[PDB]
Amino acid sequence: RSFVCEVCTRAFARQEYLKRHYRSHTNEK
Ligand SMILES: [Zn+2]
């Protein structure tokens, strides 16, 4: 199954980009 960022509900082609992408959520409000 694909991978969507429960944060920005953004989907990616790979979890990698997600895991990392999450690193950009360290401070997002
Ligand atoms: Zn996100």
Swiss-Prot record:
Paired cysteines (S-S): none
Subcellular location: Nucleus
Zinc finger regions, C2H2-type: 3-25
Effect of residue 5 to Y: Suppresses activity
Membrane-crossing residue ranges in chain numbering: none
Outcome (variant: residue 21 to Y): Suppresses activity
Its biological purpose: Required for transcriptional activation of glucose-repressible alcohol dehydrogenase (ADH2).
Protein's UniProt name: Regulatory protein ADR1
Residues of the full protein shown: 102 to 130 of 1323
